[PDB]
């Protein structure tokens, strides 16, 4: 399907295998759509983490598992100025 163009909201607190559990709710009406996922550094530049969820999609108006990069990162759910950016701090490596 086409990519989700609208924004998302956190259903609950982000849960912390080292990975994080993100529970989202879609705010748009263009479903079925694929959830855009990306990770950024403390400056907002592309800084690759790792999306665990094989194919995160919105069936109707979704649990996202991902391993954040070590240190400071921004977990981006969606595209553009609308996009939900989760500033995350991962301690270590040990």
């Amino acid at each position, epitope marked *: 399907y086409a990519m989700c163009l609208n*924004t998302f*909201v*956190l*259903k*609950k607190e*982000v849960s912390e295998h080292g990975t994080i559990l993100i*529970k989202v*709710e879609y*705010k*748009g*009406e263009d479903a079925p759509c694929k959830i855009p996922f990306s990770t950024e550094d403390g400056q907002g530049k592309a800084h690759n983490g790792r999306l665990i969820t094989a194919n995160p999609v919105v069936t109707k108006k979704v649990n996202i598992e991902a391993e954040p990069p070590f240190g400071e990162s*921004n977990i981006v759910i969606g595209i553009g100025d*609308k996009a*939900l*950016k*989760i*500033n*995350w701090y991962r301690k270590g490596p040990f």
Partner: single-chain antibody
Amino acid sequence: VKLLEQSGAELVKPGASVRLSCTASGFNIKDTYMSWVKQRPEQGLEWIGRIDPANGDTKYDPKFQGKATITADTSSNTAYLHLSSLTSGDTAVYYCSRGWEGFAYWGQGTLVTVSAELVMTQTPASLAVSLGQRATISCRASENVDRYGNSFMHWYQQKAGQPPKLLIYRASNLESGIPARFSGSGSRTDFTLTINPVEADDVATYFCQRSNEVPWTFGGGTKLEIKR
């Protein structure tokens, strides 16, 4: 579709107890938090507390400790509000509300008639604005309202005899179906709601609300009226 069905009006004696229900349909009650909000006649919104039905965790505003109790039934997809030793001060409309990043879904409310920490500074208390002009409502928090670098500040519109409606969530995001004339902005402790241009439909009471950490405190409210 997605609906929050509340139980009928209650006429209770002073000193007695009452249980109100909030039946959730079109969604799993465990997916997000469930809050209860108190509104005394002609007064502001008062966040009672919230429940996480997946683990049964409850959090309350200290003002409702020893008065209110919140439970959830995950087999019937229902949330409950328990009120103890009722007084005239408990006479109010009680709303159940779903969510964290702004309450998009509210119940119709339940009237309860009893027979005979962060500070949210919302300004102005009353606002008279001419048609086609700009109306700005301010909300000042005593502490930080940020979580994951996002300001957990939400705005609500409340018209006569109606439950509140979500306008803005996460300080600046417009809720689906809300016109472009409504806008929100803010960072740190200062937040604003702008209605430009103002029309006759905008005559309502407006409320700001934080949700990053408990209590999920509402502002005192802004009654918006039309002048010449």
